[PDB]
Design a protein around this ligand. Structure first.
Ligand SMILES: *c1nc2c(ncn2[C@@H]2O[C@H](COP(=O)(O)O)[C@@H](O)[C@H]2O)c(=O)[nH]1
Ligand SMILES: *c1nc2c(ncn2[C@@H]2O[C@H](COP(=O)(O)O)[C@@H](O)[C@H]2O)c(=O)[nH]1
Ligand SMILES: *c1nc2c(ncn2[C@@H]2O[C@H](COP(=O)(O)O)[C@@H](O)[C@H]2O)c(=O)[nH]1
Ligand SMILES: *c1nc2c(ncn2[C@@H]2O[C@H](COP(=O)(O)O)[C@@H](O)[C@H]2O)c(=O)[nH]1
Ligand SMILES: COc1c(C)c2c(c(O)c1C/C=C(\C)CCC(=O)O)C(=O)OC2
Ligand SMILES: COc1c(C)c2c(c(O)c1C/C=C(\C)CCC(=O)O)C(=O)OC2
Ligand SMILES: COc1c(C)c2c(c(O)c1C/C=C(\C)CCC(=O)O)C(=O)OC2
Ligand SMILES: COc1c(C)c2c(c(O)c1C/C=C(\C)CCC(=O)O)C(=O)OC2
Ligand SMILES: [K+]
Ligand SMILES: [K+]
Ligand SMILES: [K+]
Ligand SMILES: [K+]
Lengths: 436, 436, 436, 436
């Protein structure tokens, strides 16, 4: 029975595996737990999940799947500005609803004022829908397949493809923007070159942009932040990797809408070994979030997430969202082809600081992870997992979990190594592990 | 030389392997140590041993063997109410003594008032025994095989099968109820459905019932407790898994006769890894027992028992009884068939939260343990083991061990990892381990 | 720079591998270091080495070799009183000097008053030596082979075999008694039966006797101690295994001449795992020696010695001598035959609490260790090793090492696990280890 | 956020792997970081790198390569004084510039006053250079191959081989002495014999000499130091291995120009295990440097360097330079021939206290390390690695890093074992590691 303030303010250099959250009182069911989380000062998702901007994790496929399930994805920038922007465009155009370009096809089969060819099938035998209706109305109005929206003068003002109404109805947690499109985020560097790439990403319709760096507390990123906030006042920007409040302050002052917290704890990271710099994750998350919260800036616990327990712990310590690399790297929607080794299906996963991904000092390693299946199955599982944890701890929502932790109400307890060994599977001659 | 109060009140998150009990003064022999322990507020066994309510551990066979040796068993509820109740009935009818149903056979060979056929062999050549005698008397009275008990009017009032007098004489530590039957306990859930199952278990003659849950401090279990205490005033109820005094208080207030303490420390448990919730065992046991004792509520140290040292430590820290899963899972009396792998005989052992035992979030794993032989050999061994420990520590009884620990008299000392390595087998090129 | 008092009085439960001794000032050579140590209140050896009383370690061969090199041995009692006593007799008669029985052969070749046949070779052609001379004189007096000692009346008063003068001259560190015989010690239990065995051991000429027990603070051993001190006033007795000052006090009060300190840290020990009782060695040694010293009672650091560093640390913490089991178990002089496994020569080593060595609760395990060669090579090596350690720490003698440690002058420092890893061999692709 | 003073003054016995340096503010690039470091009170290198004086590490080849890249090398003394001195001579004569001996060839092709034959090619057709010019001038003056330097009377005063001007221009970081020669250092013992060897090393032109010992705080080394400072007033001397301020003081008082800090932490070291003496490196480095700095004496962090992180940490804690053995032992320039095992190329690496390198008490082990390539590639890599670390921590130079650490500005944080596990590569099914 120790509070977070007490636990993380003794200088022990703790991490996720070094502690536990003590159970509380249950008076609701796991399915009643709400995971709504703030991605940035203005982006809010239904789940606190985010896919990392890496070669072997996030591209269109992942970004789309992740958005459809309740989270969001960040496309990597280890490609051409053109390619990256196309990946953003694919994601952005995956779901639209009221398509305008192809409806105003252009007018200026169907015979809808102006000269809207979609012509032959005259505007009398065809079903139409008034302007001002909503997607719900739109769906029923033509319960079949193929809906031309008409503006007073009976002029084609828009159209809505049945397929979009399907995707919309199929994914109730979909992270969509004001235009009913799957929101997407992208990662860029801080060199001048990144200004051009940013412009192409802007044109692509990217919603949030993260400045990629192992140590984001620099004059380069600060000025880059200020630039972006100037050129694109509304664009949501996330600050480079930080692990201390002093670093966060500079980026917060520069104008960040959120912070990416984590240094050298990612599965493929050797920065701590090579550069001696970094910080134990659990502590990094608590300290920066505790600070950043006084400025309304969401913290993204980035790195070291090996399972659901970690996710719940990051959130419990102050993080608004959690970013994963390896916990998603082997899913169907991640970049790369599957292969086999010792009868084990694998997909490549490599650190962005690896010589391959990149005198060059390698800060990442290149490996492979075992097949995790589809994001469409895995993410729902993580969502269920997180919910149960909130239940045991007695919290109906992630927002509540933090209040309980900050009020002192939520208690923790350190785990000795024997205690960590006891917490996992032990004393078995053999066993298999499954979760969903 | 550190007291329990000092040791477990520093927030280190200790477990069984993290400490030792310092030896005292010996002025008696190991065989003089008494292990009588309170299972619940009213159930008291000769030993502090209990078999866990799990698919691969407890069914009739185990429950019977465990009772015969001095402990008790809890039948799992991962079966039909009918099946479970039949398992309780088998155990309950294993030993009876004065059988009534078949003696009042019905009257209304032998020719005993009324019309008691057991007829031919007239009541004159046959040996009979008066009503009011005891089992001891009964045994001698017909020193052979096949004893009709007669009520004044020479009317068949009961019978006693020689076989029961045998089982009774063979097992001096047998956990029997007021009717000379092997007591049995069963595990149920907390859903409404469990009320029906409970009723069938009541009819079966179950003696103690444990409410099965990974986090028993809930409104569901509290109300279930209150229900049971109402409907079955005398039934002994044990509260769902708890690890803190605050949780215990709710269940104690709800009316529990004992508490099942343990969360995520069981050999097949992944709850700590998946849900981030739980608590290091040694500490869980000391803290809750220290509290629950002020209300006369026995604590069951449930989980993490890998050997005799653990059992003795749980007891020394405040537990009245100890529940095991893996330490019994491979015995002859446990559910399942034996098989072989690398020339090693094994029997399945799986967590009740495993996908097999059961979106579903797995909290347990499915494995196999190596053959441990019969409960009838293993339990006596654990009993001997525990006794020696009490001797080294200078305690003639489990009751004494707790007094010494609560008075400060009993001392402990933390074990560094090197100290733990030194405590076990080391520096050998090869070795085999045996214990009994 | 931490003193022993500070280091071992924080309740951390440390052991040998958990700390280091910081180097001092060197103004002498390793060969100038003196290891003279008190075995008991009256037995003093040239080295602080002792072989453990175990089936696979100490018998005549070991006891003799160990004495010849500067230490001593304790014969095991897992044999008949006759056998054990014969093992003591073999050791005792290995070296004698002035043999009396065969010289007083009996008188009452050579023609020496009385009728000393050793006859033919008359007392005139034969060289003789006066009574009152010493062994040194004796050696030169007949610089060849085959010396009849003559008493005034020219009567055979004794004889001295050339072979004894050889053994005496060959081993300058030999642990011999007042009669120039290799001293020997033996281990006995505390049951009444041990009184008879003790008597046979007395007749055998045993010099020191250790009462064998895993927990020697008992009324059984206390009374046994008092008995022995009564019956054999001069016999040196060592107290059963203790690890705390409170235990030591009882045995010290009972009249022990030394204490055997150690519980569950021996390579083949499972007492800590099975009985939950014991104590981390380094701490056990410091605490009891710190106490026992106030009564002039030598402490024997028994158990957990895996190498020279451990020996030096035990001594530095207060032990007067060190007892080993595995560090000697595979030498030529130890009981048992050598065999081979994976091309590796081995000799059996088993705990005295193993089922084989012995319901029975096993407290020891049965294994094998790799061939260490002869005690006559290994012990000199340990002696050299210990000497260098004393040099680095700036102590010319074991006696000095303790003064420095008790005065505060000697400093220590805890070793984190990484620090322990760094202290040993690391970062090699492959390597072989040798020491002498 | 803990200062070095706080971190290393709690008695925890920390080492490199036990802590991290928290990142600061970046306002410069990695390539702008300066690694200029003081080898001794008067020797200053461009990099803080030094090759250890060992059989399998440093000989001419290594010493030359190491100097050319920015560091320095110390030739081992496990050879004849003649051999060692020849190794110094090879290194010293590798690069010269203004060669005098062969130019004053002797005078007393070319026809340059006196009788300088280099004769035929008369002094009129040949290009010459005035005395007083510099190497830069010299290079251009004869932009081709084959430059006779002439003194007023047109007398051959010196010569400069084109090859030297090449080596000079190729290696901008070259550690050269006042005579434009690659500086070299050598290791000697402290016995009288070492005085002769020293004399031969003096004649060889050695620049710095390190007194080789595992425990240099001795009367032998102190007097040896005083001797050398007397006989060779200008010679730079480094004090034997020390790990505490008390030891450093004696050697500092004796007159050391630098200190070699480290005891039993070297990859091939078993001194801690065998002699129980030594100290955890990170702590050894901070404590002695913190002291030695008050006397302007540079500390050489010697031992335990397994990678770049360690190097940066040693420097951050107070060391002026870092000495490596295994981190260089398998390079092309190190002594020994390459061989193969399991398809892995290896080169021998052995501790100088190994029986092979040397009753003898082994303090080192004999193994093999995997091929690291050329020093000419590896050292530049370490240089780049160190620079990035300085960048993350916000320091433009090693000198700055220490100021920040001593002022309190630089912060650190302990790493729990889980934190250390998280810091390295984890959660991968497989991976390969590369760095340059
Ligand atoms: C160290 N860290 C690196 C590198 N590339 C990316 N990253 C990071 O780690 C996170 C993924 O870690 P997981 O544990 O797999 O989730 C990424 O989000 C990013 O912060 C690298 O080369 N070295
Ligand atoms: C975690 N714990 C589980 C699960 N099923 C049962 N249990 C528990 O552990 C105890 C057995 O642990 P042992 O160390 O084997 O004695 C059981 O009594 C129960 O508390 C599960 O799926 N996950
Ligand atoms: C535990 N300890 C046992 C047993 N038999 C003997 N001993 C002890 O350990 C010492 C030898 O330990 P090493 O590390 O090998 O030196 C013996 O002197 C004695 O104290 C046993 O069965 N269990
Ligand atoms: C222990 N230490 C030894 C021995 N020979 C040399 N050394 C030392 O270790 C350093 C090299 O360690 P690395 O980790 O490989 O750099 C050398 O500089 C020297 O101090 C020995 O036999 N035992
Ligand atoms: C940039 O991607 C990362 C991130 C996000 C992190 C780390 C890291 O090593 C890399 C790879 C390192 C690279 C590509 C070098 C460029 C740079 O320094 O930004 C880390 O330690 O924590 C977080
Ligand atoms: C119920 O059986 C348990 C018990 C007793 C414990 C744990 C656990 O995971 C399960 C399996 C988890 C299940 C079947 C999910 C249902 C539930 O939540 O009750 C644990 O962590 O500590 C104790
Ligand atoms: C007696 O030999 C030992 C000793 C010396 C020790 C231990 C031990 O287990 C045994 C074997 C245990 C036996 C033979 C049971 C009898 C007894 O209890 O004496 C230990 O834990 O520390 C020291
Ligand atoms: C001398 O080389 C070393 C050094 C530098 C160190 C150690 C060591 O064991 C040896 C080998 C030990 C030898 C050759 C014995 C001679 C001696 O004692 O000097 C160590 O522990 O720290 C540093
Ligand atoms: K990492
Ligand atoms: K577990
Ligand atoms: K042991
Ligand atoms: K080492």
């Amino acid at each position: 029975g120790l509070t977070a303030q007490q636990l993380f303010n003794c200088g022990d250099g703790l991490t996720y595996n070094d502690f536990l959250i003590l159970p509380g009182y249950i008076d609701f069911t796991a399915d009643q737990v709400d995971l709504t989380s703030a991605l940035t000062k203005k982006i809010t998702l239904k789940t606190p999940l985010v896919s990392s901007p890496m070669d072997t994790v996030t591209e269109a496929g992942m970004a789309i799947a992740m958005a459809l399930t309740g989270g969001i994805g960040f496309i990597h920038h280890n490609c051409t500005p053109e390619f990256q922007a196309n990946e953003v465009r694919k994601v952005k155009k995956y779901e639209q609803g009221f398509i305008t370009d192809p409806v105003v096809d252009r007018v200026r089969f169907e015979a809808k004022m102006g000269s809207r060819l979609v012509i032959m099938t005259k505007r009398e035998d065809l079903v139409v829908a008034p302007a001002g209706i909503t997607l719900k109305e739109a769906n029923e109005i033509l319960q079949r397949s193929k809906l031309p929206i008409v503006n007073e003068n009976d002029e084609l003002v828009a159209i809505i493809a049945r397929t979009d109404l399907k995707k919309n109805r199929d994914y109730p947690l979909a992270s969509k923007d004001a235009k009913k499109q799957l929101l997407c985020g992208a990662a860029i560097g801080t060199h001048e070159d990144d200004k051009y790439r940013l412009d192409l990403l802007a044109l692509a319709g990217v919603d949030v942009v993260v400045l990629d760096s192992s140590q984001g507390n620099s004059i380069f990123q600060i000025n880059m932040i200020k630039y972006m906030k100037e050129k694109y006042p509304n664009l949501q920007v996330i600050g480079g990797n930080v692990v201390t409040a002093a670093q966060a302050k500079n980026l917060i002052d520069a104008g960040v809408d959120a912070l990416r917290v984590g240094m050298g704890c990612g599965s493929i990271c050797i920065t701590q070994e090579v550069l001696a710099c970094g910080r134990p994750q659990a502590t990094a998350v608590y300290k920066v979030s505790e600070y950043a919260r006084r400025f309304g800036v969401p913290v993204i616990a980035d790195g070291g997430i090996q399972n659901v327990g970690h996710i719940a712990k990051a959130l419990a310590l102050g993080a608004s969202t959690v970013m994963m690399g390896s916990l998603l790297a082997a899913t169907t929607e991640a970049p790369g082809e599957y292969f086999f080794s010792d009868g084990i299906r694998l997909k490549k996963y490599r650190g962005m600081g690896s010589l391959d991904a990149m005198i060059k000092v390698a800060q990442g390693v290149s490996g492979a992870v075992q097949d995790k299946g589809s994001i469409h199955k895995f993410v729902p599982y993580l969502i269920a997992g997180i919910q149960h944890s909130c239940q045991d701890i007695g919290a109906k929502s992630l927002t509540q979990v933090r209040a309980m932790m900050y009020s002192g109400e939520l208690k923790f307890e350190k785990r000795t190594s024997s205690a960590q060994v006891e917490g996992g599977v032990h004393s078995l001659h053999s066993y298999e592990k499954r979760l969903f």
